[PDB]
Write a protein that binds this ligand. Sequence first.
Ligand SMILES: [Mg+2]
Lengths: 50, 134, 134
Amino acid sequence: DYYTYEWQDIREVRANELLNHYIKEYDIPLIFNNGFMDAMTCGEEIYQCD
Amino acid sequence: YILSDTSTRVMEIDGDEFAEADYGLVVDNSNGTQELQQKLDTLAQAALQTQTLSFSTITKLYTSSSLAEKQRLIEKDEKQIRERQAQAQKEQLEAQQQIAAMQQQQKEAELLQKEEANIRDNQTKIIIAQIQSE
Amino acid sequence: YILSDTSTRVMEIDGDEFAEADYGLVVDNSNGTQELQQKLDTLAQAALQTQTLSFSTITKLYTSSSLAEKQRLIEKDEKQIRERQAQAQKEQLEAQQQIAAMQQQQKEAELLQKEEANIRDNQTKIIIAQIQSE
Ligand SMILES: [Mg+2]
């Protein structure tokens, strides 16, 4: 079934399987939610990805 | 564990150093991709009925989380069934034709029987004419 | 008592010293997994009617508590019906062929009888003319 797939498709599945996991693992929507409170208080909204 | 067999071998085909927005892939939460997601599941629900997508495929669509995998499953399951219906049309066509072949083979067998049935009456009429003439 | 026969056996594999989120499993109460539980239970009902899913398996889905268990159960019974509907079509396909097989040999038995019938009138006819010649 990967003969009907495309190269931009296999790169897109791998990108989502990385992103769908770690959003649910770290609970990233809460990390972005604390960052909005600094946005309304400083005017700054910064994150480090390490 | 979080990636597949084909997804882990992407690391070998070169250049993965380069950002994904250089290879045509962007992170997008916008009204275009929610409209494409709501279309692609409504299209699958319209394909679940009329027996175009199996119940194996639709549960893979609900647990996909990527608009291109769930696009390829609609494409893959349509090509499989439309191949199966085209060969089912073909096997039903040749079956009535071999039925048309076996009825034709027996009626010329009936036809060849009555002509060999007739001549052996005719040549034995020559025999019963022959014996008493002595 | 609270676990299955398979679920007590993953302890024998060398992985349960580590967290579950290292093997792709997280706890989730979101809009994502709540929509999946609706989409599996609605697809179960559309499979219950149109005779694709039995009443025994629907009772297993309601008391399943896992969104991947009831994914593997709807795919289980749908594979059970598609093999039965394929073999019953093939059993009906050979049944018309074997009736057509036995109707073929019986009319050839009507064919092979009348060629050996008429020659028997012929060979006794030669005995008639040979007796009168003496
Ligand atoms: Mg028990």
